[PDB]
Amino acid sequence: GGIKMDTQFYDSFTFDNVKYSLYDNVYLFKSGESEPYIGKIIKIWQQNQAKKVKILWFFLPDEIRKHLSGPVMEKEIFLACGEGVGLADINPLEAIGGKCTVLCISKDERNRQPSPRELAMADYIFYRFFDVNSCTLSEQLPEKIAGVEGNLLLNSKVE
């Protein structure tokens, strides 16, 4: 008969003395950019000995400033949603540059309301979702984003 396994996937790894897990939020620097991007790991696998992560993007206010009609909170960022260019990008695992603590304050029922402790330790907070097609912000979380169920893209199920 014979056995042949297909693609190896992962839930976690350690890189440069930091443990990263699926659905963690991370910094990623592009060459020539002064500020890092912030994104969420939504897949980890190995492909031809190369280690890859699929990153679902967050947007900092400066990154979508041209589409914003109103103000933002000091630590606010926005989770990409919808379908189209800008939603997500496959990245080398080696481009990950650190963990980012991002807390969701959405009233959506799939989000666990964060504790004061979690909010106190957050690098960024979000409750709005940037549709990359319309390029518009909404407080409505879609059923899924990038094929991932929405309840996996918010706060951890347990503090």
């Binding site: 620097f29 060459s31 890092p36 189209g84 990008d89 496959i90 080398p92 481009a95 990950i96 650190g98």
Partner: peptide, 18 residues
């Protein structure tokens, strides 16, 4: 905390974003 890497991130942006 952030830490710049030698290997660059890959990212596309929506129109008039970035």
């Amino acid at each position: 905390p952030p830490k710049r890497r030698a290997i660059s991130a890959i990212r596309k942006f929506p129109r008039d974003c970035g």
